[PDB]
Design a protein around this ligand. Structure first.
Ligand SMILES: CCCCCCCCCCCCCCCC(=O)OC[C@H](COP(=O)(O)O)OC(=O)CCCCCCCCCCCCCCC
Ligand SMILES: CCCCCCCCCCCCCCCC(=O)OC[C@H](COP(=O)(O)O)OC(=O)CCCCCCCCCCCCCCC
Ligand SMILES: CCCCCCCCCCCCCCCC(=O)OC[C@H](COP(=O)(O)O)OC(=O)CCCCCCCCCCCCCCC
Ligand SMILES: CCCCCCCCCCCCCCCC(=O)OC[C@H](COP(=O)(O)O)OC(=O)CCCCCCCCCCCCCCC
Ligand SMILES: CCCCCCCCCCCCCCCC(=O)OC[C@H](COP(=O)(O)O)OC(=O)CCCCCCCCCCCCCCC
Ligand SMILES: CCCCCCCCCCCCCCCC(=O)OC[C@H](COP(=O)(O)O)OC(=O)CCCCCCCCCCCCCCC
Ligand SMILES: CCCCCCCCCCCCCCCC(=O)OC[C@H](COP(=O)(O)O)OC(=O)CCCCCCCCCCCCCCC
Lengths: 148, 258, 176, 175, 258, 148, 149, 148, 150
């Protein structure tokens, strides 16, 4: 009949929506967050605990996620490429992004500071200065051996 | 006599492989044989109703119950270790990456794997199938073909619905009953799912189950003996096999991707 | 077929129309007229509405006969046409003859029920253990003197087909 | 009962012996004699070995007739000879032999009017909740009751409608 | 019409209650009614081999598969949290308090819940049951009574065998395949099982659903309609209902003991 | 037949053996496990994390389990009753009983430090002195507020 | 009227099934052997950050009861925690204090009670007078880093 | 159609027996009927986290298992007996064995340091000097109450 | 001659299914181009407490390879870890050092590499020269409390 077609279509849509829910919402995938975001590069000295799909934030609030990490063949540092939502586009260039630890034992995201009032961005450009991600080893080395 | 028992056992052993090959030829002639005149998409819709839409209340209620079981249980075991926020991640990971598709294959082998062999084996006992070839419509393409198609494209959808309702029910018992912090459930959940190894993993594991469940459920019926007891033995053989084809194949699919 | 062999997922109308919609692409209004006249010829015209399980066992076979006579075949086979009857069996045995003399179509009634078969049959056969055990007109087959065929055409419980089963002597059966 | 209604988990011997092991505690060698002489009476004496699905359709009914006549009942009713001639002949001969020999009441309940009247001596007709007359097969052959003359003969049309309640062969066909 | 659909819905509603009470009266008359002459322990043995012993290969193979799955899975989830030598207790917690008995109820509702409804339901269609009351043996006590006792005393045993084979198979894939330290498996396992909340918990959870699994599997057959399709619909209703009464009843039983 | 009465009984035995394996080789209640053990009392000032079915030990290796915790109605202290293995019956009376936290985040187990005395015990007697379980609040109160 | 009796028994079983859910049926922190013989008490705290419902209250480590509810008194802007006390323990004087502790290091923040000294004990339904509230990490590290070091 | 039927029957019977035997050999640890790991002893003062079947090691790499621990009824210390991989046969007698901790919160393993340099071992002998396991209570008592 | 064909097709699919799906064995991860090719190196440490196999080696945080094996050299009683290095990253100087670091605070102890100062790089199959070993809680607290504070 037509009620059979209506039901089959309704629940075929229900299953596909549940699939898209497991993908977008349960997993936290790209499509919903992808939208229109513009890339930015960043040079760090150590990226020990930042992973793909790791949040990038400013003043605590997320602006996007990091997209990929690279070991440059030239300077032996870490080049992280990260997306940034289009609405947030007033980040200055002299801004200093660093690697912060969520809570105390959470994943290491990247939080950026306020970069004065010079030229804003190209949204596809690179950041200049940073504060690298900390490591326990050098931390306790500088803490115990040298200071105390 | 022992020489009689061993001959009967070897006959059953070779008969099993004969049936395993006849099933493959049957699936071939059903899925890509020809295009008989009586076919269409209306058959596939009618089947998708009886196979998936009718099997919707069973797997939805079961997914809700298994979710509010998984959460109500893991909360109890994880409180001992000290990890509590992550019950939303642990409950979702077990259901989405494994138990979800497995229990959906167990309930879809039971409801739409028995109501499929019984429906297509009664079609054989009452000569409903034989009266099709004599009309001129290949019953493998008019009867078996939509039933196989309904199973392939409904059991993964039912497994996705199962996982969604199970996750949501686990939330509704963790948050509203067990009082774990609301937002942490979905947060801790989505940061550690890794779609390509949990969502797509379980979805491929569910597709693989659907092809092996809706084919041993549509063949068991087509190759039953035409009697009220042959059908009732086939509708049990198709639950046994399609439970062994769910569990075992899930072991072979999870070795491929942990 | 006996027990009708009616497509359960289809209603009586679409059931009778099924042979049409297969070999023919006719207008859905013209197809209804062909289905309606057929269902009338068997008397099951009023139940163009029901599902084959909402039909009694006797009428489930008449609608199947109507499905058969759709497309107007030139021969048509009846397996166990008159198994479980008496008034229902009468209408069916009248229809299988009316369809023959009226439509001029070959009818092959294939049932072990000998009385009514011979009643409507004109050239009746007997098949046994892999081979045709003679054939003929119902009377010439009534007294063919073939022990197997005279044992079949009449009751005669004992004959070529054994009444007793292959066992040991009854005298010593319970004695030993 | 029609189709045998044979206990599948029991073999033919224990099948026929079942009514004995219930009301009676007889020696297992005495039960064997009755089961053996009861199975021979129906002609199914050699198949004291098989399972009820290893038996053909018509032969399965004969073993059931033997299970029934075990314990020697004084009346016995065989609901539904049907869907089977040589077999039907042995069955219709046995239901009469068991009657005249054992002097037991037989209640044959089958639609097959011909053979029923053949062995029946006082045949009834039951319709739509009420007994629609009764009598000896000939006195019932021409009782002039429209329903009963319609049943006792073929006569496709009569009190029981040949046509279903349609609307109109002129309207429904044109409208 | 809507007034017709709602009347049909309410009729189906009240009828579902009528059947749920008729099933209780049936279970009463079956379990503690009388002592008919044809009864004995031979019936219980003959039914114990058809309800349990025949259902032994299915649940054993399935327990092996589900154990090598639970271990092969939790190891992958435990390899990230350092609790590596804690995979043994996992295949003995996620297989001994909630999933062991639940999957055993799902496979016992499928094999011996569908093979017990199509065997006790095909006896009603062929008048095998009606020919018992006219002999004088109450079929509720001669046919239904043994099947009820061979379900009660076999599904817990099958669940114990299921848990044992699952634990051992999880060992055989953790130790011999995944290379976790052998002795730690059983050691970490047995120090944190807490018998009174794992073993006896799962065993009571298996007795509970297992009893329900063979009550709504032996009733649906006894109250089917006597036809080759009524039996085939009852052997599906008894898989659906005995999967719901496994899952939901496991929720009700785990909400009492986490 | 007897081909079934043996098959049926065989697996009625197999299932009961599986039950016994679950009760014995999967949980380890009593087959040669913890057996003849004698009770000892202990008065503590705080047993915050001391749960039932714990571990009372000596020099790291376990001595037995703790059986029951109680709040005595007179002094409002924590009286624990714990089982001590029979083979270990040489603990002096003066020995101390502290509550040590297993590892760094494990369960609070009772640990006995040998004091050293000729008299041992009655295995049904009580212990004299102790050191109560530590609580983080008082710990940091003495650390931050009081000490520095 | 057989259907009537069948529906009656079905409803009788459905009733038990409804009561078979046992969604928080009995309410306590232990079995009914001890029973529900417990009477309330209140406590005024300044910060109860981790004293979520269905916790534990104790003395000298051994639990005394479970917290029943937490409230925000709109007048003095403090926290009022109402909890239950087992009846066998009926000797906690008034001058005794309550204080939020933590089970180990990352456990649920229970509330312990330190007994002081006074003849009168309670009325088991009264309110405590003094306490030491639950410290958060932030005030702790502020007091630690900026002030002392 | 009769000679090869019994042939496939015997093939399947042998395959089933093969499965049964290849499953059985998991229990009764599958290194034949015995292994090649020689023992060694060690006396500690506290083995709080050295429960049975731990890892022994040198320089971080695992050497063997801890077989058993026992409260020697004379000294009230802990005797740990542990298997050593036979290739590892060159640790001198004066080597020390201290209870370390896996990372930061892992189960305590025991690690052997070379110590001195003399006669190697008997591989079944006893170790002499060691540093016992740490306990958080004594640690904080020394840190807070004693030092700070 | 149908049944024979049916048995043949059953054997065909059955034989194919076991090889294609089971045997749970060696990796064939596109061994037709570039293999994700990696060449090993050795590294001498002094304590390798948490560098268990299936770990990671890295430089500046981003992964460079995985640890293949750990070994105790019977002569020096020290640890030799052999690991893999991605082919694209092939400019690691000699005096570049390795050191066991910890992911976050409770993560798996991986092996980071700090760049050195000489020109010549590697043969990707050599060993490293100098390192900083892994830390342990016991030695850490022993150097903290007993010597500096006390
Ligand atoms: C990718 C292609 C897909 C093809 C198949 C993929 C994998 C599927 C694997 C099939 C699993 C088989 C289990 C069947 C169990 C069963 O039916 O078990 C149930 C049957 C039921 O018997 P009946 O057929 O009488 O009902 O039990 C038996 O017949 C008794 C034992 C028979 C077992 C035979 C095993 C055959 C396996 C093939 C090896 C033989 C080699 C032949 C060389 C000459
Ligand atoms: C210095 C400060 C001292 C405090 C530091 C200790 C804090 C860490 C606590 C340790 C807890 C721990 O070991 O474990 C803590 C970890 C890490 O935290 P997460 O909960 O966020 O993962 O949690 C888990 O283990 C998560 C459980 C997930 C389970 C998923 C389901 C498993 C199988 C699924 C398929 C089947
Ligand atoms: C990602 C890769 C894609 C995966 C593709 C799916 C593969 C398809 C497999 C086909 C399965 C066979 C279907 C047969 C059709 C049928 O009706 O088959 C019916 C016949 C039975 O014939 P009868 O009618 O005579 O009983 O065969 C069966 O009984 C089949 C039982 C299937 C059991 C599946 C078990 C597989 C798991 C094996 C694990 C072993 C591991 C051991 C390690 C210790
Ligand atoms: C005052 C009296 C009110 C009546 C109460 C009766 C309620 C019980 C029956 C539910 C309605 C069933 C309608 C059938 C649907 C249909 O179309 O009918 C479909 C099927 C049967 O018909 P089919 O022949 O089509 O299979 O019905 C069912 O699926 C039966 C449902 C069984 C559920 C009853 C037991 C549930 C117990 C849990 C109760 C606790 C609730 C918890 C939440 C808080
Ligand atoms: C390496 C091969 C892969 C191993 C598994 C392959 C999957 C298919 C085989 C599973 C068994 C199929 C039985 C189906 C159930 C059935 O017929 O249903 C139960 C039937 C009942 O027979 P009916 O047809 O008469 O009702 O019981 C039987 O007669 C089946 C006999 C088969 C026995 C073999 C299996 C026993 C143990 C399984 C292997 C042990 C694992 C450990 C090894 C490491
Ligand atoms: C299906 C899987 C469902 C649950 C599987 C495991 C659940 C949690 C996984 C471990 C998280 C880490 C916790 C930790 O710190 O570690 C917890 C301990 C580790 O303790 P040790 O390292 O001290 O031995 O191990 C466990 O994970 C506990 C046993 C796991 C059994 C799961 C309980 C049943 C779940 C049923 C659901 C199905
Ligand atoms: C917040 C949400 C939480 C809600 C949770 C709801 C849980 C409900 C439980 C699910 C059970 C569904 C039963 C399905 C049966 C059905 O549909 O029932 C319907 C069928 C008949 O329906 P038909 O009309 O279709 O034939 O009933 C039967 O055939 C008989 C089954 C009766 C068995 C009922 C189960 C009761 C169990 C009581 C024992 C408990 C012991 C515990 C002691 C410790």
């Amino acid at each position: 009949t037509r009620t059979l077609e209506i039901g089959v279509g309704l629940f075929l849509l229900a299953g596909l929506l549940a699939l898209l829910l497991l993908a977008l919402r349960v997993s936290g995938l790209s499509v919903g967050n992808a939208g229109d975001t513009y890339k930015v590069y960043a040079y760090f000295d150590n990226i020990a605990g930042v992973t793909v799909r790791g949040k990038v934030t400013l003043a605590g609030v997320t602006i996007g996620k990091v997209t990929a990490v690279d070991l440059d063949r030239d300077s032996y540092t870490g080049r992280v490429t990260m997306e940034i939502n289009q609405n947030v586009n007033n980040l200055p260039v002299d801004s200093t992004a660093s690697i912060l630890t969520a809570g105390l034992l959470g994943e290491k995201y990247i939080g950026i500071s306020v970069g004065g009032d010079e030229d804003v961005l190209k949204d596809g450009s690179t950041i200049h200065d940073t504060q690298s991600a900390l490591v326990l080893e050098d931390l306790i080395g500088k803490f115990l051996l040298n200071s105390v | 006599s022992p020489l009689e028992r061993i001959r009967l056992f070897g006959r059953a052993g070779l008969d099993v492989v004969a049936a395993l090959g006849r099933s493959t030829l049957f699936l071939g002639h059903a899925l890509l044989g020809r295009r008989t005149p009586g076919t269409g998409l209306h058959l596939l819709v009618k089947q998708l109703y009886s196979v998936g839409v009718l099997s919707l209340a069973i797997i939805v209620v079961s997914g809700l119950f298994i979710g509010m079981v998984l959460a109500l249980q893991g909360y109890n075991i994880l409180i001992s270790y000290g990890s509590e926020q992550a019950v939303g991640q642990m409950v979702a990971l077990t259901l989405l990456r494994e138990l979800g598709p497995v229990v959906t294959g167990l309930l879809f082998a039971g409801r739409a794997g028995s109501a499929l062999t019984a429906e297509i084996g009664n079609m054989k006992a009452t000569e409903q199938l034989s009266s099709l070839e004599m009309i001129g419509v290949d019953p493998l393409k008019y009867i078996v073909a939509p039933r196989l198609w309904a199973g392939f494209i409904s059991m993964p959808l039912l497994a996705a619905i199962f996982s969604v309702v199970g996750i949501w029910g686990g939330a509704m018992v963790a948050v509203d009953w067990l009082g774990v912090y609301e937002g942490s459930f979905w947060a801790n959940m989505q940061n550690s799912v890794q779609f390509t190894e949990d969502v797509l993993n379980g979805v491929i594991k569910s597709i693989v189950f659907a092809f092996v469940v809706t084919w041993i459920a549509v063949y068991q019926g087509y190759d039953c003996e035409p009697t009220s007891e042959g059908i009732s033995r086939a509708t049990t053989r198709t639950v046994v096999y399609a439970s062994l084809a769910v569990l075992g194949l899930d072991f072979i699919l999870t070795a491929l991707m942990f | 077929f006996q027990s009708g062999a009616l497509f359960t997922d289809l209603d009586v109308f679409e059931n009778v129309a099924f042979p049409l919609r297969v070999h023919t692409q006719l207008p859905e209004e013209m197809i209804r007229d062909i289905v309606l006249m057929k269902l009338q010829a068997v008397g099951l015209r009023g139940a163009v509405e029901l599902m084959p399980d909402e039909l009694s066992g006797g009428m489930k076979r008449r609608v199947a006969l109507a499905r058969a006579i759709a497309l107007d075949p030139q021969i048509l086979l009846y397996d166990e046409p008159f198994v479980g009857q008496p008034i229902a069996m009468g209408v069916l045995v009248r229809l299988i003859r009316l369809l023959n003399d009226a439509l001029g179509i070959t009818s092959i009634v294939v049932s072990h029920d000998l009385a009514e078969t011979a009643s409507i049959a004109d050239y009746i056969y007997i098949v046994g253990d892999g081979r045709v055990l003679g054939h003929g007109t119902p009377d010439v087959l009534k007294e063919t003197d073939d022990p197997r065929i005279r044992q079949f055409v009449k009751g005669i419980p004992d004959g070529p087909v054994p009444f007793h089963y292959p066992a040991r002597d009854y005298r010593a059966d319970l004695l030993g």
